[PDB]
Amino acid sequence: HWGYGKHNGPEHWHKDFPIAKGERQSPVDIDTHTAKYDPSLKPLSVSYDQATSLRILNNGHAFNVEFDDSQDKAVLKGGPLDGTYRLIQFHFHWGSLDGQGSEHTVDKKKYAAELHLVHWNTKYGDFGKAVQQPDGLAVLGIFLKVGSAKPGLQKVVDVLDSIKTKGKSADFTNFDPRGLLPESLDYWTYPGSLTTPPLLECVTWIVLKEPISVSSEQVLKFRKLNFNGEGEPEELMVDNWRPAQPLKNRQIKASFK
Numbered sequence: 699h700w701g702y703g704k705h706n707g708p709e710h711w712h713k714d715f716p717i718a719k720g721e722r723q724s725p726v727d728i729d730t731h732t733a734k735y736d737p738s739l740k741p742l743s744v745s746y747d748q749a750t751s752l753r754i755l756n757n758g759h760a761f762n763v764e765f766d767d768s769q770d771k772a773v774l775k776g777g778p779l780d781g782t783y784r785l786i787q788f789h790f791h792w793g794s795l796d797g798q799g800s801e802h803t804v805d806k807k808k809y810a811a812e813l814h815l816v817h818w819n820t821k822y823g824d825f826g827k828a829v830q831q832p833d834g835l836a837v838l839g840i841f842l843k844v845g846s847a848k849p850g851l852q853k854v855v856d857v858l859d860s861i862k863t864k865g866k867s868a869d870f871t872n873f874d875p876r877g878l879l880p881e882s883l884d885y886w887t888y889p890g891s892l893t894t895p896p897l898l899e900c901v902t903w904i905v906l907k908e909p910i911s912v913s914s915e916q917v918l919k920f921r922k923l924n925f926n927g928e929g930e931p932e933e934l935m936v937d938n939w940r941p942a943q944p945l946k947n948r949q950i951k952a953s954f955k
């Protein structure tokens with residue numbers, strides 16, 4: 699099955715998932731000079747006070763921190779979004795070196811990692827019906843650079859050694875995702891897709907301009923995870939990013955002048 703290796707990575711995915719060569723695939727490069735400020739964008743609202751985290755899972759591609767989405771609790775609204783979107787999970791993508799790791803790029807610059815907070819449109823009942831719709835999902839994307847440690851990331855880092863291999867999970871209650879946000883909510887937005895198979899074209903992307911800073915030690919611990927399962931040869935979980943895809947007939951809009 700699919701992955702990030704030479705033999706099963708991004709350049710192969712189109713054979714099982716033809717939408718890989720679709721009209722609104724992600725990630726993309728954000729050309730900051732071509733992005734236009736959009737005065738029609740409403741204020742973004744990220745309301746995480748009631749977020750209820752449950753569990754952290756190594757899925758053999760990344761780790762997911764999963765939330766209880768059975769009530770209206772951690773929601774994203776405003777900006778380009780119509781209505782209310784409910785947080786279901788977050789995960790990251792990162793490199794084998796600090797010079798690469800993000801999926802979106804900014805004027806071709808790769809960050810060391812990228813965080814995705816995934817939300818589904820509450821008009822559609824749950825996530826599974828939301829991914830049948832062209833406005834089913836909203837993903838808040840946040841770049842990570844290497845510098846000072848991010849304190850609100852450390853409880854994630856400290857549980858990783860308990861989910862080293864594919865299929866492992868751990869309790870991960872009482873985690874506050876507010877600690878992963880930068881100060882500013884300035885963002886770029888465009889319509890795109892999931893970035894791993896099944897690559898579905900359901901996502902309103904909201905990519906924050908301000909990166910968060912994490913320490914070298916925090917990202918080095920991400921790189922100790924494994925793609926493999928327990929007992930199998932070690933293949934370190936690094937470089938689990940899809941590169942930029944053609945923009946096609948899309949415009950990237952800025953929330954800021």
Ligand SMILES: O=C(O)c1c(O)cccc1O
Pocket residue numbers: 700701702703704706925933
């Ligand atoms: O993601 C993977 O499945 C993978 C491999 O199976 C082998 C090397 C690198 C890699 O990312």
Ligand SMILES: O=C(O)c1c(O)cccc1O
Pocket residue numbers: 824825826827
């Ligand atoms: O969360 C859900 O309700 C869900 C999924 O997370 C995946 C598939 C179907 C579905 O309803």
Ligand SMILES: O=C(O)c1c(O)cccc1O
Pocket residue numbers: 814816837891892893894895896897
């Ligand atoms: O690729 C993704 O972006 C993705 C999600 O964001 C949520 C669930 C599955 C998935 O592949």
Ligand SMILES: [Zn+2]
Pocket residue numbers: 789790791814893
């Ligand atoms: Zn992702």
